[PDB]
Amino acid sequence: STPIQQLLEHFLRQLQRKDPHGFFAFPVTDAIAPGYSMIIKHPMDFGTMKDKIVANEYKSVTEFKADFKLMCDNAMTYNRPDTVYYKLAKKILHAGFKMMSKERLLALKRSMS
Numbered sequence: 001s002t003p004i005q006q007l008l009e010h011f012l013r014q015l016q017r018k019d020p021h022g023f024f025a026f027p028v029t030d031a032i033a034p035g036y037s038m039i040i041k042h043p044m045d046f047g048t049m050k051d052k053i054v055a056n057e058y059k060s061v062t063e064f065k066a067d068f069k070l071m072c073d074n075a076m077t078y079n080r081p082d083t084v085y086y087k088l089a090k091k092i093l094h095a096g097f098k099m100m101s102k103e104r105l106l107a108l109k110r111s112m113s
């Protein structure tokens with residue numbers, strides 16, 4: 001494993017703890033959510049992100065954050081605001097942006113000196 005992979009696995013593990021039922025663990029299928037693919041053109045889930053870390057597909061934390069935000073935005077676009085999925089996506093989004101804030105990344109960058 002590489003330092004970036006170890007860092008991204010840490011961030012991913014903390015985010016996945018916020019989803020105990022595994023609603024974001026794997027892709028949303030049309031069988032699980034009628035007409036999902038008709039609406040969501042760029043799907044994302046934690047499993048796809050985990051596979052990207054394992055394959056060394058992330059060149060930056062910014063790219064990892066963008067995939068995470070896409071996952072949450074898709075749930076908030078597809079599901080209405082009073083649903084379990086919309087609420088959980090909003091919760092996960094705020095938790096990830098707190099964990100990977102510019103302040104926290106700058107402190108990590110300074111510690112690499």
Ligand SMILES: COc1cc(-c2cn(C)c(=O)c3cnccc23)cc(OC)c1CN(C)C
Nearest residue numbers: 021022023024025026027028032033075085
């Ligand atoms: C990855 O699997 C699942 C996804 C969803 C699921 C997720 N997201 C993000 C959605 O937007 C969504 C929207 N509508 C309907 C369903 C979902 C639900 C599941 O069942 C209740 C499973 C099934 N597993 C927990 C075993």
